[PDB]
Symmetry: D2
């Protein structure tokens, strides 16, 4: 029937039988623009760098204090991959800076096709006796900060009248209390925010599907991004990887490839789900 | 071994499995105790033989006092009204003191207080978002904090029950689109991973931490807001094709609070009439 | 007659204001009849002893080899709790014995209002190099056997035109690979079958809700049931916050919750009784 | 642990998605997901064996020749019923003999047996377990047997389902996926166990859980009202296409996912959120 002809047109079965078509083209980010938060840190800058090499304009977003490190990273990535990689400072806990970041993203870059909302922090003393300061500091940065930065991203997309890809950095702390030889790590408030970020991403996926916007999370395990260099002896290293079958820390590049996949058309039917990158931690 | 892991306790004639659901000699509190889930949980625990503090907003003091008097007479336990806005850190600090002074100790807490702020969708404003976090997430944290602080200071175990939600796992489906539970869903997911950490962290101290995730419960909050077509439309994705009742949450709170759940910690019990299946 | 008057009658708010009402009555199994598979094991007999003490008639079901043990336990629990507790031997891999079980359940009990599908096995050499023999034996017993015993339970319920509660024993192994000092324990096929039982239970919960039948899984962690007999013990309890094995009565109390009206709005979900393992 | 590989003229993140010199096989290679996955891995520069029922031998050969021409790689056809242990043993030997070794396996073969509801018979139940569970375990087992015997790592990819996580929803009732859902759930915990057990061997094990994908299996079996009634709970409000599964299979097969093991990627256009 015409009903079957409609389905056969809507859903092509074998694009690989077109000479001009390639499955590798899906991982391209050419003619696309977006921003990366916490882009001074290992996961942020490496993710941004991977998106730039795929051929995307990337605004490197981090604290005002990182302005110098941002602008030189923005310059290095620009000359390396011949892309418009700019630097924009914004404290994500300050609404005024977030409101002004929205303005500069649209003006300096052009639009937002993707957003890697990676900015986050683990506060010391984040255990069962996490104080009001330790609790609220984590909630204000991880949950409220992300929400705001996530909001301006999908605000621009709808206002510009096109789709896009939201990638929120969660954690296994959002799934499990991180195991350390009988006792858990201090990730009480930290885990709560990442679990909140996860179900937030899931809601936006459901709500913004009609707008052509996908929303997914990456839950990295132990990744050696530079966060705690010279702050973990090999006794600690080998002790931490007890419960990681692969018995090694992840690297920034192994997260960068996952961000690329979620940002690109390779994941065009992936929304409202999580991709764990933990070397099999979640199995235990 | 063997001596500390009895295989067949039922072979003792003076033992009974039903004694594990008893709460006689137990003392604790319930937040949101003016609401359907809270007051029915409080009444269940009191009927099981516990002393209960009914905790809610200052504006609910008269209702709480009425409820507390009613439950005391019916069940013959110490049921008292104690007001606390969980957003106010000063009132939470005072709540800790009055719990200890008027009950003696805390062996259980049902941290049930929560709101659904209107306009909680993709376009959630700073106010709608932060209000939901401040009440549901921060409010539940600090009320949870004083409960296990009292337990450890008094040198005994206890059971924390946090009210999460189905919204914490899934976005509530209604006729193609999700219901506005953007911030709400986020706070309930946070509470579930919060309770999990505490379960692992406070096992040393003999304290269990678990969540209940209610589906659709006819608590009083839906009265006069929905019609029959809306009722049926909401329950399209609920196999049992009916709202749960306050007694069905109350029986679950008694299980997790009592010794029946003695080896149950860092987990969640969904009470949603099979919603989560879909 | 008003829409709100119907809702008020459908959904009572404060049943405790009925002086004849008690929340503890929801845990009674008086006038309820059911069966427990693997009833010779620790989890099985204790669950049965609990349900009998709550006031239920119980058929104790296990392998033909356990007949004498089942008879002794069935006579013991009958004297103790003053209910009709009977023994009915059945190999869950044998379709003729399971058809014979369905007959004797209706003939000797009268009906089936609850079923604890607890029978299960852990086969030696169940690792990455699990053989066709080890794999298929696990699947034949754990998955296919549990399916059959579960099927006749909800067949009897629907044939007798009433609801009931199915309880399937899953495991921690169904969610995660059990941790031992860097490597997983041999639960390759075992883990697979327990994960299959969980999603099997979840389908039945959705399908049988209209028939008034509830389906739930219990996922025990490390329970000292008698299947076991400082070292090794502590290595396994390294990732258990409570740093102790569960006892059979701690699973039995979870079964009684799921079998009783205490869980009347609980269906298509799992209850982890693992002392906080899942957290790690 | 390098911190910034991007700061290197001899490095590309896109190169991680290459399969140059990689050898492996795809079960269910006659169907939409299988053949399009194979095509994607072939175009990435892998030698690929198309594995399906003996009845599909002619179709597999035509595809294997078509794919070999377009992508200039050794794409071959092998018959194997996954319910037959003798044919699986024959497959293992033929895989090594015709490819050389197996660096990856996409265990994608599966069936949805009609009458698979609450009253799924012994015949309907056992058929689903035989094919989906025992057959997937077999084809998986010979894959990591070869990898380890040949003393190198690899990537196992098992096709699970949405049905493995949730009972598919349609107008207030679950669709008949009783045994189906059970097998797909078993495959996910199977994959998780292998991920933990074979990590030291350099072998990764992951699952893909498709929602509704217009692979060809739905052709002429659903009308427009039925189509729309199914997409009520899919926010993207459309079926997936074989290419959208293929891109996911390539990610999990390739070095792009080098730190991804013992997990699942749902490709359901947002289904899981409800
Ligand atoms: N590397 C890991 O082990 C790991 C594991 C799980 C989760 N994560 C998460 O990944 C993300 C990146 O972490 P990382 O490993 O690269 O270490 P990192 O500390 O270098 O990265 C965090 C970055 O977020 C920025 N940040 C914090 N608060 C901010 C604020 N108000 N405004 C703007 N920027 C702010 C920081 O400046 C930093 O550059 C974090 O969100 C972290 O929670 C990391
Ligand atoms: N009824 C349902 O269908 C349902 C479903 C999922 C989750 N929940 C959650 O269960 C819990 C109780 O639900 P309910 O049905 O009884 O609704 P409810 O509104 O009647 O009960 C919640 C109570 O929390 C109190 N509250 C709000 N803000 C407070 C604050 N700052 N400080 C102290 N108290 C405050 C309220 O006064 C109220 O009495 C809530 O957390 C709710 O989010 C309910
Ligand atoms: N550490 C634990 O105790 C633990 C943890 C997780 C899951 N489980 C599961 O709990 C259930 C009971 O475990 P248990 O601790 O009592 O050990 P158990 O071996 O003593 O009990 C299992 C019983 O099932 C019976 N069985 C095996 N195959 C059978 C067949 N074809 N037909 C009839 N009966 C058969 C056995 O005879 C046995 O009595 C099992 O399914 C087990 O996999 C146990
Ligand atoms: N298309 C979807 O919407 C969808 C959704 C969820 C899961 N899946 C699963 O994805 C996989 C591919 O499905 P599909 O959409 O391409 O449908 P399909 O039926 O066209 O492809 C499956 C292939 O497996 C083969 N097969 C069946 N039994 C076999 C046996 N004993 N031995 C060897 N091969 C056998 C079949 O010949 C078939 O070519 C399946 O496992 C399916 O269960 C598909």
């Amino acid at each position: 029937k015409t009903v079957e002809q409609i389905f056969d047109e809507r859903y092509p079965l074998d694009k690989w039988k077109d000479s001009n078509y390639s499955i590798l083209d899906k991982f391209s980010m050419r003619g696309r623009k977006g921003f990366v938060t916490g882009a001074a840190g290992g996961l942020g800058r490496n993710a941004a760098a991977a998106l730039a090499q795929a051929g995307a304009d990337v605004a490197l977003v981090d604290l005002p204090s990182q302005e110098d490190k941002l602008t030189e990273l923005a310059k290095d990535m620009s000359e390396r991959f011949g892309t418009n990689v700019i630097a924009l400072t914004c404290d994500v806990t300050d609404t005024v800076q977030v409101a002004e970041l929205k303005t500069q993203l649209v003006e300096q870059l052009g639009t937002v096709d993707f957003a890697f909302l990676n900015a986050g922090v683990n506060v010391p003393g984040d255990d069962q006796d996490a104080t009001e300061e330790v609790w609220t500091r984590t909630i204000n940065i991880n949950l409220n900060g992300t929400y705001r930065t996530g909001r301006i991203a999908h605000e621009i997309m709808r206002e510009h009248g096109h789709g896009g890809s939201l990638i929120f950095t969660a954690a296994l702390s959002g799934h499990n209390a991180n195991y350390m030889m009988g006792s858990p790590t201090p990730v009480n408030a930290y885990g709560a925010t990442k679990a909140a970020i996860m179900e937030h991403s899931r809601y936006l996926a459901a709500a913004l599907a009609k707008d052509g916007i996908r929303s997914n999370t990456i839950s990295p395990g132990y990744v050696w991004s530079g966060i705690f260099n010279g702050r973990i002896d090999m006794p600690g290293h080998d002790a931490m990887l007890e419960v990681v079958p692969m018995h090694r820390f992840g690297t920034n590049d192994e997260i960068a490839s996952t961000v690329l996949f979620l940002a690109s058309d390779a994941s065009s039917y992936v929304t409202g789900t999580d991709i764990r990158v933990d070397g099999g931690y979640s199995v235990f």
